[PDB]
Design a binder for this molecule. Sequence first.
Ligand SMILES: O=C(O)c1ccc(-c2c[nH]c3ncc(-c4ccccc4)cc23)cc1C1CCCC1
Ligand SMILES: [Cl-]
Length: 264
Amino acid sequence: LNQYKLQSEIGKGAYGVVRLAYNESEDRHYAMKVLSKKKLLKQQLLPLERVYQEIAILKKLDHVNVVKLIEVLDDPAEDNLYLVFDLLRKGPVMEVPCDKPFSEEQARLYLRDVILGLEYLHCQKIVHRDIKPSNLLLGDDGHVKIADFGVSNQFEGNDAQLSSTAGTPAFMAPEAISGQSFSGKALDVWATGVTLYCFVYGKCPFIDDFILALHRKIKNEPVVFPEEPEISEELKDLILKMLDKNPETRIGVPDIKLHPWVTK
Ligand SMILES: O=C(O)c1ccc(-c2c[nH]c3ncc(-c4ccccc4)cc23)cc1C1CCCC1
Ligand SMILES: [Cl-]
């Protein structure tokens, strides 16, 4: 739309692409997500319907640990739909794999951010469904914000009752990979455990190039802390509680906030 110059591509989420966008008059840069309606059709909730579900979520979001939607340039004549967010120019906090992970204490501060954001979203009746390091954007204030609401869902009552899979394989909980329907909240906690694991190790806890072997490692193998880097027994204990294969016993968000690794 009139007031923005679209510059280079900066990231690519689940749908569309994100481009750096300059407001020439305002002397100010933004993150613009661009969706092509022709491209959407090729990828019972239809596309274009699914986009406006996302937009409905995005408009509610008002938390320091979640991204902020500014406006929607949305001309029915044009093919493109444009979603304008505030820019966090540093981008994702981490891309996995990577050789240099964060210290345990830097990881703790990033987990607090992600938990506070998740709590907000859960309080607001949203589940994210694709929490991973590459969807956590680093602010200039040192805090991460949760991005990419492409597979996220609104729900009623205590929890989202979900049938199908969505988001990234490596961060899907055992119960989601089928038959019976499962907790939204619990799937978000599992992904955040895998995220916490990535923060301190730089690699996922279950790794395989073939998806069937990944599924079995997720469903059956235990979490394995390598000897190096060394982390604390208190952190290991939180990770095992978050990567608990049974969603009934798995630690919920309110008790993660009271875990001694989180608080001290
Ligand atoms: O696809 C999405 O749903 C989506 C929507 C908005 C943003 C965003 C809002 N502010 C932002 N500031 C900065 C950046 C950014 C900067 C540098 C590198 C990558 C991303 C991205 C954003 C990001 C995304 C995804 C793209 C990849 C990361 C998640
Ligand atoms: Cl990995």
